[PDB]
Amino acid sequence: ERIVLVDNKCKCARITSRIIRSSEDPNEDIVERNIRIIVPLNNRENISDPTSPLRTRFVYHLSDLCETCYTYDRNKCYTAVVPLVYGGETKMVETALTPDACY
Amino acid sequence: ILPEVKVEGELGGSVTIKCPLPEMHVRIYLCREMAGSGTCGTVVSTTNFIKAEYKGRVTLKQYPRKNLFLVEVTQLTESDSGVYACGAGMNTDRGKTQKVTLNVHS
Amino acid sequence: LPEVKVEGELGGSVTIKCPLPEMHVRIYLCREMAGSGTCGTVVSTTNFIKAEYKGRVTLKQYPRKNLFLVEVTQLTESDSGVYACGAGMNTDRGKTQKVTLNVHS
Amino acid sequence: LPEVKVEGELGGSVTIKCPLPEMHVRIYLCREMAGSGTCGTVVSTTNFIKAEYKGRVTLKQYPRKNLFLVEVTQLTESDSGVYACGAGMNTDRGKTQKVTLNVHS
Amino acid sequence: LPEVKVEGELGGSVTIKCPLPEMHVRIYLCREMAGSGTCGTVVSTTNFIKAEYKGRVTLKQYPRKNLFLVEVTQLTESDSGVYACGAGMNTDRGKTQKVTLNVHS
Amino acid sequence: LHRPDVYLLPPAREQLNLRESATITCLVTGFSPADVFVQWMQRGQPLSPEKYVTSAPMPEPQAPGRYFAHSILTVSEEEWNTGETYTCVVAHEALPNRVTERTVDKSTGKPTLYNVSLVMSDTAGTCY
Amino acid sequence: RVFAIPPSFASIFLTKSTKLTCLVTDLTTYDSVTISWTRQNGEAVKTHTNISESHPNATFSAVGEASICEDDWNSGERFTCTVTHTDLPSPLKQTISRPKGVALHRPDVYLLPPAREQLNLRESATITCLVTGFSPADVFVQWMQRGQPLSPEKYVTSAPMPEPQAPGRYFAHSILTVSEEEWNTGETYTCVVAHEALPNRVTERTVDKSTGKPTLYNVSLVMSDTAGTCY
Amino acid sequence: REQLNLRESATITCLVTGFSPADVFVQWMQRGQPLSPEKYVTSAPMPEPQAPGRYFAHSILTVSEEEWNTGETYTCVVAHEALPNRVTERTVDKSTGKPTLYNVSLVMSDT
Amino acid sequence: REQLNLRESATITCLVTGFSPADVFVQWMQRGQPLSPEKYVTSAPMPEPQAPGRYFAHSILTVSEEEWNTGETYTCVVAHEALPNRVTERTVDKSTGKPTLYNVSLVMS
Numbered sequence A: 001e002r003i004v005l006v007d008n009k010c011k012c013a014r015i016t017s018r019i020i021r022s023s024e025d026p027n028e029d030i031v032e033r034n035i036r037i038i039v040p041l042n043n044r045e046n047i048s049d050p051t052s053p054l055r056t057r058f059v060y061h062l063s064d065l066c067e068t069c070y071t072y073d074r075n076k077c078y079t080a081v082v083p084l085v086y087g088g089e090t091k092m093v094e095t096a097l098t099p100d101a102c103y
Numbered sequence B: 001i002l003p004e005v006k007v008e009g010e011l012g013g014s015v016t017i018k019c020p021l022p023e024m025h026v027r028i029y030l031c032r033e034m035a036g037s038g039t040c041g042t043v044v045s046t047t048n049f050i051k052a053e054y055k056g057r058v059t060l061k062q063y064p065r066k067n068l069f070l071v072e073v074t075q076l077t078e079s080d081s082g083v084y085a086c087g088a089g090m091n092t093d094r095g096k097t098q099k100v101t102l103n104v105h106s
Numbered sequence C, D, E: 001l002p003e004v005k006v007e008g009e010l011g012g013s014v015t016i017k018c019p020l021p022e023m024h025v026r027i028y029l030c031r032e033m034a035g036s037g038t039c040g041t042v043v044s045t046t047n048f049i050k051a052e053y054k055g056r057v058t059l060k061q062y063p064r065k066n067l068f069l070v071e072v073t074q075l076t077e078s079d080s081g082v083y084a085c086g087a088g089m090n091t092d093r094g095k096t097q098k099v100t101l102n103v104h105s
Numbered sequence F: 001l002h003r004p005d006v007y008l009l010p011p012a013r014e015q016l017n018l019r020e021s022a023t024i025t026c027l028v029t030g031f032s033p034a035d036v037f038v039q040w041m042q043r044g045q046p047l048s049p050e051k052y053v054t055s056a057p058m059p060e061p062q063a064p065g066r067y068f069a070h071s072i073l074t075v076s077e078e079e080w081n082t083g084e085t086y087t088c089v090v091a092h093e094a095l096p097n098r099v100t101e102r103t104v105d106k107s108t109g110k111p112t113l114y115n116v117s118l119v120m121s122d123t124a125g126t127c128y
Numbered sequence G: 001r002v003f004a005i006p007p008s009f010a011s012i013f014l015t016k017s018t019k020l021t022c023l024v025t026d027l028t029t030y031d032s033v034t035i036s037w038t039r040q041n042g043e044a045v046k047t048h049t050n051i052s053e054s055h056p057n058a059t060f061s062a063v064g065e066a067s068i069c070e071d072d073w074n075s076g077e078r079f080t081c082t083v084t085h086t087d088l089p090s091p092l093k094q095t096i097s098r099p100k101g102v103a104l105h106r107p108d109v110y111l112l113p114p115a116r117e118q119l120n121l122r123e124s125a126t127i128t129c130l131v132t133g134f135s136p137a138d139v140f141v142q143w144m145q146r147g148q149p150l151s152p153e154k155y156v157t158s159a160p161m162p163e164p165q166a167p168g169r170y171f172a173h174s175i176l177t178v179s180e181e182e183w184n185t186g187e188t189y190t191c192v193v194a195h196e197a198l199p200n201r202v203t204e205r206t207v208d209k210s211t212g213k214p215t216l217y218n219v220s221l222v223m224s225d226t227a228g229t230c231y
Numbered sequence H: 001r002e003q004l005n006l007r008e009s010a011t012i013t014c015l016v017t018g019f020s021p022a023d024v025f026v027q028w029m030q031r032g033q034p035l036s037p038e039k040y041v042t043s044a045p046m047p048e049p050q051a052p053g054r055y056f057a058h059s060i061l062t063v064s065e066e067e068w069n070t071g072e073t074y075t076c077v078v079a080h081e082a083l084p085n086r087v088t089e090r091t092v093d094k095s096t097g098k099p100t101l102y103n104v105s106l107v108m109s110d111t
Numbered sequence I: 001r002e003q004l005n006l007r008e009s010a011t012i013t014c015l016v017t018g019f020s021p022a023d024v025f026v027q028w029m030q031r032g033q034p035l036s037p038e039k040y041v042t043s044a045p046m047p048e049p050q051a052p053g054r055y056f057a058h059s060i061l062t063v064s065e066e067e068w069n070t071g072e073t074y075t076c077v078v079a080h081e082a083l084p085n086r087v088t089e090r091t092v093d094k095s096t097g098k099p100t101l102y103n104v105s106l107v108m109s
């Protein structure tokens, strides 16, 4: 019944809508609008860099939804580079920040 | 939402359960979610695991060709009833993909 | 998990059969009040006998068949509910086996 | 993001430098009212020059260096605030560049 | 409210003058620690002399002038702060009079 | 020479109180030089020309070179229980895609309630 | 005593250049000693020069290295290391065979902050890093602070040990110790690990004061234009 | 908490540090009843880098996630020849790292 | 609570119940250092009224409120002759059972 206006996965906002029938009449058919955001309190500021401070402020301009990101995507891989000094050989190596989703 | 396939037993002795097999995921479980809290408790899963109660009566066979995985449970008792789920990923709750119900007429 | 669904008659006595586990000292036959999600212990190894059941119940443990038997003498309408038996310091967290009771009169 | 922090003198004229983007037809030099979180369009390619700025401002676009220049003739105390410039049908969603203005007299 | 701003010298002794009220039995000379909004009782009629001030202070009450006098023998840099005196069970909700102390050496 | 801006409006709230009919208005402004016409299609099927009534291009109140036009259409009141969305369209030479299909439905419009249900968790990182 | 150390996955993975070493110790000092390498079919491979100097306590300390193909090692071909000394006329033969690979599995990395009671003492804080359930045993672990690697002597790493709950599975530990002031200055520490199963061969977890079991949840939820225009 | 999301098992770790000399003894029990010795593993005393001659050790125990959630407490006991009573205990449960307080601040607007 | 609104001292009690036989040993130590036996008192094994063939004891410790508001785990060790290894201990601090506190600050507009 409910149509979907927004399915953003970066902000996990699901804007939907539905019109409910009145008490056996075509009048006062009140419309609805459901919004469901799921805030992550453990994610960092720069989601692709595990050194930036924690994410405190959350700004949601609903107009844009219907680029800084807040949450990860179950269908994608995030990677980075770290210096491994193994054998006295400082070496930048790629690292799967979000493993199990890079297979 | 995803399908709500339902199965029955017609007296105990054997039962068979099938759920869709997702791609690019290594974990597969059949948690029963039969708890008052609601937190699903993984019964039989890959990545090596099993249920303290459910042992020797539970097995998993993944078939990528049919995009399905198969779990076979021998016999039947009163405890192993109610509902069951299926899914993938590394979060038993929030990662489900089906809601199957198990019942026995015995 | 298992339910004895024990049955009896008004007056006389009825025996409640519950499993006697090992590595668990306190053994109780809690009564599922089911009021505000709280269970009140009827009898325990701590010699805790409820006032309403004082002088009418007993608990005997003997690890022969890994069973402890609790007998309830006399009977009243009040004695017609659920008496989950279990072990552990927290009574509510235990109560492994569930049983039901009624009156036939 | 970038701030020209352009400066000028009372009277005369001052030129505001803002980037001219591609795949965006409407180009505006909105004024950040910052009253109830609303920005009012001063000029646009759709042809709308605010009444207070009528006959004193112009907007010329030429994709030579990917820049569009807006000139403000005359000057008043009122002309001493923020004029975020941007593109797109929505005005309070663009504001690609922020700039500040003042008066020296 | 009133401040004696009492002054003294290193060594010797200094007398703190504070009002002796009626209908209040516990009389104390609390020290305003002003650390986490807390005041620690230095002396009281209930008999509690802080360890740091043990054997160096005394409290004598006389109804002659609705005044009670407290004497501090010896002196240390530590003895250079605020010693609000008051009455009642709650020490932080009394502090009838505030006073300051210092050292001259 | 500017892009012809277009808009659409739903029937009035007080109009849905006599139970006779309803009107939907598609406003077309700009399109310099004035070259537009509107065809009201529903479900991809053009409606009869006798229903929608386009009139003429008219200069804007302040018209350096701009113009505008208005076109309405008449429907039945009892048919709005399902919407059907009654799509509008415009055509002009100063358009990269020379079509700007515009459509609205009972569902689209002013929300009469805002049921926001935000949640806080420390396991939303993945946003399954 | 003749000691043989096979090359590690990390060496072959990072340094790329791979070699196997046999060393002798607890042996009377005697020059003119030959170090050789033998496969199961008897073929000999080149042994490298630059033998290590003898230990100051009058005992041997030598290095002998050779290069064998990584595909050859993956083929599971048995190799033998031999050394010659006049004291023992019979050369000592030892095996450095690589047993291919048993079922591969990914190592779950959990990183935990210092205990609350420990911080009460306000002396020093210890951060742990529990790798878990990796088969086989080949995990290289390291620590860096705010993008700068730390000395290997500032932390201690365990060795793979069997897992009672999981047959054919191994786990390991690692702890780092720092002063309380450093932990209380929002400094950030991470525990990078390296294993064959890892898809990128390297993964990392990170914690700081704010993320390790925090006391407060400061949040500034702010939304605007809720009505807007949504389609 | 990351391990808990799997709804399979849980690992409590007991960390003994700073003692000298070696030969410490660690055992696990709950509600006063000793636990089976086939469910936990203990490391041997290992030298401490900065410390001149002090050692450390660590033991881990695996329990069902359900059991952790049920609310059961698990105590860890160490026996060394230097403690005045030669015995010490610690305790952890679900109520250990709960956030002490929230400070949310919604500022809903339409402009 | 009302004891602490005095700024002079606080008392911590260590109730021991249901043991048999007598001769239980209780002492108070702070962060591994046993405290002087003069700083605390102890009751004597007296019978449990409703529970027959049983005993219970008591022990209190006086302490300044200045230092109680800073930490000092203050564990209470008990030495009976029927414990699994003859010794047990418990501890409580200023934040033993503080619950969760919400500070919602809606700026609804």
Ligand SMILES: *[C@@H]1O[C@H](CO)[C@@H](O[C@@H]2O[C@H](CO)[C@@H](O)[C@H](O)[C@H]2NC(C)=O)[C@H](O)[C@H]1NC(C)=O
Residues within 6 Å of the ligand: A046, A048, A049
């Ligand atoms: C967030 O982190 C990313 C990754 O470090 C930053 O972008 C990288 O910047 C470096 C140079 O500083 C480049 O080598 C990388 O190629 C960039 N990453 C990508 C994906 O292009 C990014 O700038 C950071 N954001 C902030 C605000 O600091």
Ligand SMILES: *[C@@H]1O[C@H](CO)[C@@H](O)[C@H](O)[C@H]1NC(C)=O
Residues within 6 Å of the ligand: A032, A034, A036, F115, F117
């Ligand atoms: C309001 O939102 C809640 C949460 O999504 C939902 O359960 C409820 O049905 C909604 N109410 C209406 C009238 O849509």
Ligand SMILES: *[C@@H]1O[C@H](CO)[C@@H](O)[C@H](O)[C@H]1NC(C)=O
Residues within 6 Å of the ligand: G218, G219, G220
């Ligand atoms: C908590 O948030 C406020 C703003 O809402 C900020 O002023 C303060 O610094 C934050 N607390 C910390 C510890 O950063």
Ligand SMILES: *[C@@H]1O[C@H](CO)[C@@H](O)[C@H](O)[C@H]1NC(C)=O
Residues within 6 Å of the ligand: G216, G218, H103, H105, I105
């Ligand atoms: C708590 O929230 C208020 C309101 O945002 C803020 O002013 C204050 O700084 C916050 N406290 C902390 C410790 O973050």
Ligand SMILES: *[C@@H]1O[C@H](CO)[C@@H](O)[C@H](O)[C@H]1NC(C)=O
Residues within 6 Å of the ligand: H103, I103, I105
């Ligand atoms: C509680 O909320 C009030 C009002 O916003 C704020 O002033 C105060 O700092 C908050 N306290 C904490 C500990 O955040």
